[model samples]
Target: MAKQDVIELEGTVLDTLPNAMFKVELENGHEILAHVSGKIRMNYIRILPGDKVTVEMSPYDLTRGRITYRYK
Candidate 1:
């Protein structure tokens, strides 16, 4: 991938939603909806409630994000 800038926030899953979506609470205490990223999904990474995750969001919109990393 080319050099790109996205807002990445570390957070923990508050809940799992249908269709593989999740409710995450960032370190800053902001809540946003997220989904496992394509690569992670392809790898079959499982994100459970209370799991730590890293989310990437476009700075333009903070309401939604993508789960890029699921911390062990």
Candidate 2:
């Protein structure tokens, strides 16, 4: 299997959803679904709506990503 390269983009948390999912609005006006990554989940990092977050995405599918970092 080939390894996929991940792309990182900055966005804001628009809405919090069930199953730890979120709707994020990016700088370019693109909205996508994101979820907490492993580290965030393990450490109990909470992300709320309207907060700035860093999302790790895939070039192939820009509609989904992982909410990796949150701005303080």
Candidate 3:
């Protein structure tokens, strides 16, 4: 299924980087580069350090991810 092609993880934002990118530490203790998803940008949802977020990563490349949801 198309949905299974991507893996989702819950992580905490460790830092903000240029071009709306972020460094996030996942629940498994691994860190990865992430960026805001299109919907998030369209909605003006901001992500900051220490914020909890959900990231979607392609199975072929786990080093980078798309920030999908931000939690309060």
Number of the top lDDT candidate: 3
In candidate 1, position 9 carries an lDDT of 80
lDDT tens digits by residue: candidate 1, 1-72: 232478888788889888778998887888989988887767768898889999888878676899878897
Best by TM-score: 2
Report the lDDT tens digits of candidate 3 across residue range 13-32.
88888887899988887888
Model 1, stretches more than 4 Å misplaced? 1-4
When 2 and 3 are scored with lDDT, the better candidate is 3
Clash pairs, candidate 2, are none
- Give per-model TM-scores: 0.83, 0.85, 0.84
In model 3, what are the clashing residue pairs, if there are any? none
lDDT of 2 by residue, 1-72 (tens): 134788788798889888878999887879999988878778878998889999888889888989878988
Off by over 4 Å in 3: 1-3
Per-residue lDDT value at 27 in model 3: 81
